[PDB]
A and B are shown apart, each in its own frame.
Chain A
Amino acid sequence: DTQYILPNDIGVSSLDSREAFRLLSPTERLYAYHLSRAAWYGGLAVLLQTSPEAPYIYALLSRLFRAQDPDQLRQHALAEGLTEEEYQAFLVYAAGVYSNMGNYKSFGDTKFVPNLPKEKLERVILGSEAAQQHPEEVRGLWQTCGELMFSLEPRLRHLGLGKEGITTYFSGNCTMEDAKLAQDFLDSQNLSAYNTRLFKEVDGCGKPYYEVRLASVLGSEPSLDSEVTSKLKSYEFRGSPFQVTRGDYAPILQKVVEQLEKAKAYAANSHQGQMLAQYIESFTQGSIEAHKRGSRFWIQDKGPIVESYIGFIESYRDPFGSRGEFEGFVAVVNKAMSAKFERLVASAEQLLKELPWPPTFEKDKFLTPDFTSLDVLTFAGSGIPAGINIPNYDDLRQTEGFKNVSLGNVLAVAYATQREKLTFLEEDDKDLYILWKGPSFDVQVGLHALLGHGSGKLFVQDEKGAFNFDQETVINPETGEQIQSWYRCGETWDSKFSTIASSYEECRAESVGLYLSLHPQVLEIFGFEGADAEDVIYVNWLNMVRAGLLALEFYTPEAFNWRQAHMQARFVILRVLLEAGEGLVTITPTTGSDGRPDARVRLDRSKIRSVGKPALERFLRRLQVLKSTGDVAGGRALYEGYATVTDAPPESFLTLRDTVLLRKESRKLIVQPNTRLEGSDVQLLEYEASAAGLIRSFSERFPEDGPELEEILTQLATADARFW
Chain B
Amino acid sequence: IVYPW
- Which residues of A are at the interface with B, using a C-beta cutoff of 8 A? 107, 314, 316, 383-390, 392, 410-411, 413-414, 445, 448-449, 453, 502, 505-506, 509, 566
- Write the chain B residue with the least CB distance to A448: B3
Q: Point out the residues of chain B lying under 8 angstroms from A566, CB to CB.
A: 2-4
Q: Which residues of B contact A506 (CB under 8 A)?
A: 1-3
Q: Is A386 a contact partner of B4 (Cβ separation < 8 A)?
A: yes
Besides the known contacts A387-B3, A445-B3, 16 further A-B residue pairs in the complex with CB atoms under 8 A apart = A314-B1, A314-B2, A384-B5, A385-B5, A386-B4, A389-B3, A413-B5, A448-B3, A449-B3, A453-B1, A502-B1, A506-B1, A506-B3, A509-B1, A509-B3, A566-B2
List chain A residues, Cβ under 8 A from B3.
385-389, 445, 448-449, 506, 509, 566
| B2 lies within 8 A of A316 (CB) | yes
Q: Write 25 A-B pairs (CB below 8 A) sorted by A numbering.
A: A314-B1, A314-B2, A316-B2, A383-B4, A385-B2, A385-B4, A385-B5, A386-B3, A386-B4, A387-B2, A387-B3, A388-B1, A388-B3, A389-B1, A389-B3, A390-B1, A410-B5, A413-B5, A414-B5, A445-B3, A453-B1, A505-B1, A506-B1, A509-B3, A566-B4
The 8 closest A-B pairs by CB, nearest first: A386-B5, A387-B3, A414-B5, A385-B2, A448-B3, A389-B1, A386-B3, A385-B4
CB-based nearest B residue for A411: B5
Q: How far is the CA of A283 from the CA of B2 in the complex (A)?
A: 23
Nearest residue, chain B, Cβ from A316:
B2
Q: Which residues of B contact A390 (CB under 8 A)?
A: 1
A-B Cβ contacts below 8 A, count:
41
Please pick, from A107, A389, A392, A413, the residue contacting B4 in the complex, using a CB distance under 8 A.
A107
Closest to A449 in B: B3
Complex alpha-carbon distance, A488 and B3, angstroms: 29
**From residue A454, how far is it (CB to closest CB) to chain B in Å?**
11
- Which residues of A have CB within 8 Å of B2? 314, 316, 385, 387-389, 506, 566
Measured between beta carbons, the chain B residues less than 8 angstroms from A107 are: 4
Which residue of the partner chain B has the closest CB to A314?
A: B2
Considering only CB atoms, which chain B residue lies closest to A502 in the complex?
B1
How far apart sit A314 and B1, CA to CA, in the bound complex (Å)? 7
Within the complex, what minimum Cβ distance (angstroms) separates A468 from chain B?
A: 22
Across the interface, which residues of A come within 8 angstroms of B5, CB to CB? 384-386, 410-411, 413-414
List chain A residues, Cβ under 8 A from B1.
Answer: 314, 388-390, 392, 453, 502, 505-506, 509
Residues of chain B lying within 8 A (CB to CB) of residue A411: 5
B1 CB, nearest partner CB in chain A, Å: 5
- B2's closest neighbor in chain A, by CB? A385
Cα(A387)–Cα(B2), bound, Å: 6
A595–B3 Cα gap in the complex (Å)? 36
In the bound complex, how far is the Cα of B3 from the Cα of A414, in angstroms? 13
Smallest Cβ-Cβ distance to B3: which chain A residue:
A387
Docked CA distance A526–B4 (Å): 20
Closest B residue to A446 by CB, please name it: B3
Q: Which residues of B contact A505 (CB under 8 A)?
A: 1
A384 CA / B4 CA spacing, docked (Å): 8
Q: How far is the CA of A383 from the CA of B4 in the complex (A)?
A: 9
* B5 CB, nearest partner CB in chain A, Å: 4
Determine the chain B residues whose CB is within 8 A of the CB of A389 once the complex forms: 1-3
**C-alpha spacing A410/B2, complex, angstroms:** 14
Considering the chains assembled together, what is the distance between the CA atoms of A390 and B4 in angstroms?
A: 14
* Bound form: Cα–Cα A385–B3 in Å: 6
Nearest Cβ on chain B to A501's Cβ, whole angstroms: 10
In the complex, what distance in Å separates the CA atom of A271 from the CA atom of B2? 25
A residues in contact with B4, CB < 8 Å: 107, 383, 385-386, 566
User: Closest CB of chain A to B2's CB: distance in Å?
Assistant: 5
A388 to B5, CA, bound (A): 11
Distance in angstroms between the alpha carbons of A414 and B4 in the assembled complex = 10
Give Cα A351 to B5, complex, Å. 25
Residue of B nearest to A565 (CB): B2
User: How distant is the Cα of A388 from the Cα of B4 in the complex, in angstroms?
Assistant: 9
Q: Which residues of B contact A388 (CB under 8 A)?
A: 1-3
Closest to A445 in B: B3
Shortest distance in angstroms between A45's beta carbon and chain B's nearest beta carbon? 18
For the complex, give the distance between the alpha carbons of A392 and B2 in Å.
Answer: 10
Question: Given the complex, which residues of B lie within 8 Å of A445, measured CB to CB?
Answer: 3
Residue of B nearest to A415 (CB): B5
Contacts of A509 in B (CB 8 A): 1, 3
The CA of A509 and the CA of B2, in the complex, are separated in Å by 10
For residue A387, which residue of chain B has the nearest CB?
A: B3
Chain B's closest residue to A413 (CB) is B5
